[PDB]
Design an enzyme around this catalytic site. Structure first.
Site, PDB file in Angstrom:
ATOM      1  N   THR A  20      25.165  69.735  20.477  1.00  0.00           N
ATOM      2  CA  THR A  20      25.994  68.994  21.960  1.00  0.00           C
ATOM      3  C   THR A  20      26.573  70.084  22.210  1.00  0.00           C
ATOM      4  OG1 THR A  20      26.268  67.327  20.469  1.00  0.00           O
ATOM      5  CG2 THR A  20      26.683  67.483  22.580  1.00  0.00           C
ATOM      6  N   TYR A  32      22.675  56.314  23.239  1.00  0.00           N
ATOM      7  CA  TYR A  32      22.233  55.559  23.995  1.00  0.00           C
ATOM      8  C   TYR A  32      21.920  54.041  23.326  1.00  0.00           C
ATOM      9  CZ  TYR A  32      20.695  53.989  28.573  1.00  0.00           C
ATOM     10  OH  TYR A  32      20.227  53.038  29.899  1.00  0.00           O
ATOM     11  N   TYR A  58      24.395  64.342  11.376  1.00  0.00           N
ATOM     12  CA  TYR A  58      25.670  64.655  12.264  1.00  0.00           C
ATOM     13  C   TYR A  58      25.861  63.555  12.457  1.00  0.00           C
ATOM     14  CZ  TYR A  58      27.335  66.701  16.493  1.00  0.00           C
ATOM     15  OH  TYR A  58      28.695  66.771  17.235  1.00  0.00           O
ATOM     16  N   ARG A  99      30.289  60.394  20.503  1.00  0.00           N
ATOM     17  CA  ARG A  99      29.045  61.186  21.791  1.00  0.00           C
ATOM     18  C   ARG A  99      27.913  59.818  21.895  1.00  0.00           C
ATOM     19  NH1 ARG A  99      29.508  65.665  24.320  1.00  0.00           N
ATOM     20  NH2 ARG A  99      31.783  66.133  24.484  1.00  0.00           N
ATOM     21  N   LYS A 141      27.367  65.881   8.979  1.00  0.00           N
ATOM     22  CA  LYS A 141      28.370  67.064   9.981  1.00  0.00           C
ATOM     23  C   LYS A 141      29.108  65.862  10.367  1.00  0.00           C
ATOM     24  CE  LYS A 141      29.378  69.200  14.135  1.00  0.00           C
ATOM     25  NZ  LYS A 141      28.229  69.475  15.622  1.00  0.00           N
ATOM     26  N   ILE A 161      30.732  73.651  10.806  1.00  0.00           N
ATOM     27  CA  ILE A 161      30.215  73.630  12.235  1.00  0.00           C
ATOM     28  C   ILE A 161      31.250  73.702  13.322  1.00  0.00           C
ATOM     29  CG2 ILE A 161      28.329  72.767  14.012  1.00  0.00           C
ATOM     30  CD1 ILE A 161      26.493  71.859  11.166  1.00  0.00           C
TER      31      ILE A 161
HETATM   32  N1  LIG Z   1      17.134  68.576  23.641  1.00  0.00           N
HETATM   33  C1  LIG Z   1      15.514  69.112  24.580  1.00  0.00           C
HETATM   34  C2  LIG Z   1      15.085  67.627  25.329  1.00  0.00           C
HETATM   35  C3  LIG Z   1      16.354  66.558  25.421  1.00  0.00           C
HETATM   36  C4  LIG Z   1      16.056  65.672  26.205  1.00  0.00           C
HETATM   37  C5  LIG Z   1      17.145  64.346  26.186  1.00  0.00           C
HETATM   38  N2  LIG Z   1      17.670  64.703  27.599  1.00  0.00           N
HETATM   39  C6  LIG Z   1      16.510  63.356  26.902  1.00  0.00           C
HETATM   40  C7  LIG Z   1      16.015  62.449  25.484  1.00  0.00           C
HETATM   41  C8  LIG Z   1      15.151  60.803  25.744  1.00  0.00           C
HETATM   42  N3  LIG Z   1      15.461  60.053  25.028  1.00  0.00           N
HETATM   43  C9  LIG Z   1      14.427  61.860  26.927  1.00  0.00           C
HETATM   44  C10 LIG Z   1      13.183  59.765  27.272  1.00  0.00           C
HETATM   45  C11 LIG Z   1      12.903  59.295  28.243  1.00  0.00           C
HETATM   46  C12 LIG Z   1      11.898  59.307  28.548  1.00  0.00           C
HETATM   47  N4  LIG Z   1      11.569  57.967  30.164  1.00  0.00           N
HETATM   48  C13 LIG Z   1      16.361  59.933  26.433  1.00  0.00           C
HETATM   49  O1  LIG Z   1      16.418  60.091  27.957  1.00  0.00           O
HETATM   50  O2  LIG Z   1      16.855  59.068  26.269  1.00  0.00           O
HETATM   51  C14 LIG Z   1      18.000  64.111  25.545  1.00  0.00           C
HETATM   52  O3  LIG Z   1      17.519  64.255  24.585  1.00  0.00           O
HETATM   53  O4  LIG Z   1      18.834  64.441  25.415  1.00  0.00           O
END
Ligand SMILES: NCCCC[C@@](N)(CC[C@](N)(CCCCN)C(=O)O)C(=O)O
Ligand SMILES: [Mg+2]
Ligand SMILES: [Mg+2]
Ligand SMILES: [Mg+2]
Ligand SMILES: [Mg+2]
Lengths: 296, 296
Positions: free
Chosen positions: A45, A109, A135, A140, A164, A205
């Site tokens: 993060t 999410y 983690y 978050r 963590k 960490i």
């Molecule tokens: N660390 C490098 C890649 C970062 C990708 C992403 N920004 C989005 C992750 C994702 N699963 C992308 C899939 C969405 C496709 N519709 C998300 O947005 O939930 C995250 O993991 O926070």
């Protein structure tokens, strides 16, 4: 179980003209190595994992692995994802590119159930043969890895060796180590580094270690040697900077502090992350004056 | 301002073997159209946006636009991201592929400040010329779009026209419409659909409508026509199913209900999401029996 413990830094990711400043990144990792840090965590993060591309994420793991060769400093690669297929891919990349282990944040999410978290981490752990650190940061992610799920994963998955915790829940940290004393509990909350270590936690960490690696390293090693008076003294002294580094969302204050200390070139974030307010900028600058910040 | 309001469905994404069942997806949308629904929302939270590839996400938007052509049903494409560059990309794709507008969730996990949310959404709104509906769900994102930020974005950006609130905060929904009565407040919380509509909300983006589109449609249309008596009556009757559909994390219960109703072939999720527990499976099945489910 193979473990990665001790004083560890969640590395910030410096940007320069919207791209990863790869020389600043390697220079910052070498500053960590030279101030007693035991392991570095690229692209957590604090490293703005959400806004890096999958290719930049991979580049930063490689730079960390390359920079720590020939030292005792380990690389605990940030490999978390809210999609299990993506988390397995990052774990496999980290294994094949020389990382000593992986940190894997609970999916954010989409709020998986405890059963889903178990299967999520079991698929990750079964995909590589390097240590896996859970983690938990519910503020978050919107989800919590329960103590029962953490303990089950530790006992069922050979390379899952601890967690963590960034949950402000010392009761849970007692719960974890009272029922499974062999796991490696790692503090993900700088202000309470010492209490977590004093209950049998085996490392940190840290966000603050980006700015004051020597102090966080000394704190952790004092505590691991059961020199609790010296460990608590540093933890108490660090409280003001530990809190002000979260006056806004991490890593906005720490990158502000690194910029104010001249350790990074520009105060650049990737949206939706942004420069702090003018007041908070001044509050970070004022608290820094009470600490000695190591240079390069 | 161009707006997309009324009864809207957060479409589930059925899987068949390891991929998206595209024919079932189109079949489900036509069932929604036939049951009075005003708009469909492809690839939201209920559509498992986190575990879809960017190509699968794009495919589901295309199917929705294809299927709703020649009907009055609009497509409010899910285009949110916790990385602003990705959210801009999804917004531009939705515009160029015929979506009537976009739903854009507040960034999750990296927890931007109010200033960051403003710049995040201003960059999205300036990238397209189609309506943009904000989406606030702090339980899942870890951040909240404040009332002041929503109103500022509404007043500053031409295509930002309202917010889908899933915050269990009717006080905030009074706050929003009392200070900015021109915005389109959309309920993202099925159990309190009627209270939000009765305070001047202009639509719902519903999970329950996946299973009972005719009932959610009637509820919304009763309320918009100021027949509060019948709108509350359907809302009261739907409470039990509205609650049981979140006994586990959405969309696990709704996909279980769609499978139990014979509306999808397999009860398939993508990890870390998983089929529900067994007694929760029985509780969803038992509550479904009190409702009349429309077929195809
Ligand atoms: N660390 C490098 C890649 C970062 C990708 C992403 N920004 C989005 C992750 C994702 N699963 C992308 C899939 C969405 C496709 N519709 C998300 O947005 O939930 C995250 O993991 O926070
Ligand atoms: Mg980019
Ligand atoms: Mg060397
Ligand atoms: Mg010693
Ligand atoms: Mg209609």
């Amino acid at each position: 179980k193979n473990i990665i413990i001790g004083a560890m830094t969640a590395l910030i990711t410096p940007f320069k003209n919207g791209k990863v400043d790869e020389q600043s990144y390697a220079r910052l990792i070498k500053r960590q190595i030279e101030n007693g840090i035991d392991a570095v965590v690229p692209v957590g993060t604090t490293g703005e994992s959400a806004t890096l591309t999958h290719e930049e994420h991979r580049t930063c793991i490689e730079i960390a692995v390359e920079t720590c060769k020939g030292t005792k400093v380990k690389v605990l690669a940030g490999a978390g994802s809210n999609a299990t297929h993506a988390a397995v891919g990052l774990a496999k990349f980290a294994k094949e590119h020389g990382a000593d282990g992986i940190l894997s944040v609970a999916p954010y999410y989409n709020k998986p159930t405890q059963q889903g978290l178990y299967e999520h981490y079991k698929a990750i752990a079964q995909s590589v043969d390097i240590p896996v650190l859970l983690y938990n940061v519910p503020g978050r992610t919107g989800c919590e890895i329960s103590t029962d799920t953490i303990i089950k994963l530790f006992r069922d998955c050979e390379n899952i060796y601890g967690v963590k915790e960034a949950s402000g829940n010392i009761d849970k940290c007692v719960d974890l180590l009272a029922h499974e004393p062999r796991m490696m509990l790692i503090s993900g909350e700088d202000a309470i580094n010492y209490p977590i270590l004093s209950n049998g936690g085996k490392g940190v960490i840290s966000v603050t270690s980006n700015l004051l690696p020597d102090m966080i390293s000394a704190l952790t090693h004092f505590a691991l040697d059961e020199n609790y008076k010296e460990a608590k003294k540093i933890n108490d002294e660090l409280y003001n900077i530990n809190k002000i580094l979260f006056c806004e969302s991490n890593p906005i204050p720490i990158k502000t502090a690194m910029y104010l200390a001249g350790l990074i070139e520009s105060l650049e974030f990737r949206l939706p992350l942004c420069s702090p307010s003018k007041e908070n900028f001044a509050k970070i600058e004022e608290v820094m004056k009470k600490y000695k910040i190591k240079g390069f």
